[PDB]
Symmetry: none
Subunit: 298 residues, 2 copies
């Protein structure tokens, strides 16, 4: 296996029409909102997120992630500021539940009932008439306070799944930090993200169980953590090896964040843990070598 | 220990019920969207039955999915004398329920394979391990029950036309909403007791008590829904079950009960069950709970 040529091939985008798919999904979801007499009067931002936005998508059948964010509903994380975490007696006019229901109705009115399915977190939209395949998430404004000052917060999005709980997302920070790192590495960062995502997909489809619990976004975060110096040179294989090496040797003592540099990459709030990452890294390290004499599951 | 037994029997069939229902819905929706005929039609694909209503107790229960063609309408005018299709603005359709059901069969077989799809008199039985689908997929069209001569004075549900003939009206949205309302008013005790009594019926049926055999799950869900909320209070599930059995046995003869949708009458020539069967089962269950 020529891993240099394979990684160069695997560094490509899923296609050259990714911007087209993302913009078409965005515009059709905006049209769905604008046709809703309830939602068209609300303060709502519709924007792409996920791997299509970040140019890290590698699968052509990947749904476009569209965030529909109601800006006038706010949920804040006060856990970092001592003494910052009452209730008002008047109810807020619009609730997250009513917002998600009205979004469901708007999507169904625009794309038809066959094209919309309500999920726990987002709507799965598959509308052949408009050729839209999208994961459309209802979000509200999310805040992380870092001081007791009224303006001392970072702004992102917040999701309230049907099954309970609160999820904080930072899509703008994700995108912006990824672009910044791509500039600092002369575009090598996202090339290597895509190569490693395709490596993980390859391993998962070949039945390597260590690859299955390692999703795309986790790998984007992990590769983002690798210092820029390891992306230099003219060997993509050396870049991949540097990433695996750095991550494996630094993960145990680390307290890494996601690519947004706001949310912790590991903890009880995440679906993954350091052991799974380490097992995957060992699998990947062995798999790219030319001839292994021995195997490491001990 | 009937208290702990009923508490255990009140649990859902598993912790993955919502996942199973959603997967069934999405895979059937994908089959429809792959159909060159059906993908352009106004069709709703949605779960109904015990998975939708959170009253399922058997892990091997198939997910009930309704595939409803909304642009075909069958109207019930039996409550409004002098109401017809012209007074309801319904144009005659070229497309028939028969061909719709055949096209649904084709869509399902194309996605899940011929081996994974069986046509029944009412619905398709779908069992495809590759997609992890175990479902009863019923073809329905829009059904209407008119309550006045106004052209918008109707209640909307679904309508099924079995291969062997006849017409069945269903009201899955009303079923779901009324069940949710009663579950809220009783602090979730309603559906816990529904599940406990369904497991009691299944236990009795598998032990050879013949009176349990003609008592299906949906009938018991309706019957428990009828019981007033006061009998779901307290901290004894056993007392809740006994209250339901007592109330139902003592009120059934003079009653004119409806299904949980509060639209269809629970007993009559349109149903597969009758009051005598319910009473025989209630006596069986009451005696079985006492003699143990
Ligand atoms: O666990 C998660 C999953 C998803 N997300 C957020 O939701 C976005 C989209 O969720 P996603 O599952 O589509 N992941 P994505 O990065 O688009 O990769 P892929 O579709 O496989 O090519 C991610 O990019 C994250 O920003 C999380 O923050 N945490
Ligand atoms: O943190 C998150 C997690 C999830 N999401 C968004 O919510 C969607 C659903 O997230 P999901 O975990 O419910 N299911 P998934 O397998 O990712 O996709 P699907 O097959 O459509 O059910 C994801 O695809 C993301 O777009 C976020 O936006 N942020
Ligand atoms: O006689 C019937 C049978 C079924 N149905 C409708 O069809 C739905 C599903 O039919 P079902 O036979 O699966 N009964 P279900 O309530 O799901 O309980 P379970 O044994 O756990 O599967 C039922 O919930 C009813 O709403 C009727 O309306 N009348
Ligand atoms: O009123 C009805 C009746 C039936 N159905 C749907 O049609 C499916 C088949 O209905 P069925 O009566 O042909 N067979 P069923 O009693 O459900 O199972 P079994 O005893 O093992 O033969 C049911 O499981 C429901 O999903 C309805 O949706 N509404
Ligand atoms: Mg994505
Ligand atoms: Mg997605
Ligand atoms: Mg999706
Ligand atoms: Mg059922
Ligand atoms: Mg069934």
């Amino acid at each position: 296996i020529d891993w240099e040529q394979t990684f160069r091939k695997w560094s490509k985008p899923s296609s050259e029409t990714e911007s087209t798919k993302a913009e078409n999904a965005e515009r059709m979801i905006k049209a769905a909102i604008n046709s809703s007499q309830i939602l068209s009067t609300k303060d709502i931002s519709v924007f792409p997120q996920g791997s299509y936005r970040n140019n890290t998508n590698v699968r052509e059948d990947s749904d476009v992630d569209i965030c529909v964010c109601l800006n006038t509903l706010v949920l804040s994380d006060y856990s970092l500021v001592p003494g910052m975490n009452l209730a008002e007696l008047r109810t807020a006019s619009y609730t997250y539940k009513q917002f998600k229901s009205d979004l469901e109705t708007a999507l169904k009115n625009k794309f038809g009932t066959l094209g919309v399915s309500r999920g726990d977190k987002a709507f799965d939209v598959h509308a052949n008439s408009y050729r839209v395949d999208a994961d459309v998430v209802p979000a509200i404004q999310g805040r992380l306070y870092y001081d007791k000052n009224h303006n001392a917060f970072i702004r992102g999005t917040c999701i309230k799944p049907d099954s309970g709980g609160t999820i904080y997302n930072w899509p703008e920070q994700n995108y912006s930090n990824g672009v910044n790192k791509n500039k600092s590495t002369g575009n090598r960062f996202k090339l290597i993200v895509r190569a490693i995502k395709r490596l993980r997909n390859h391993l998962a489809e070949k039945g390597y169980n260590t690859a299955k619990p390692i999703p795309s976004y986790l790998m984007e975060c992990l590769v983002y953590i690798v210092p820029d110096q390891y992306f230099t040179g003219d060997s993509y294989k050396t870049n991949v090896e540097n990433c695996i090496n750095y991550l494996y040797n630094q993960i145990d003592s680390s307290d890494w964040t996601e690519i947004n540099e706001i949310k912790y990459l590991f903890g009880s709030h995440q679906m993954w843990n350091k052991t799974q990452v380490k097992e995957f890294l060992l699998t990947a390290w062995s798999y790219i070598q030319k001839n292994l004499e021995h195997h490491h599951h001990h």
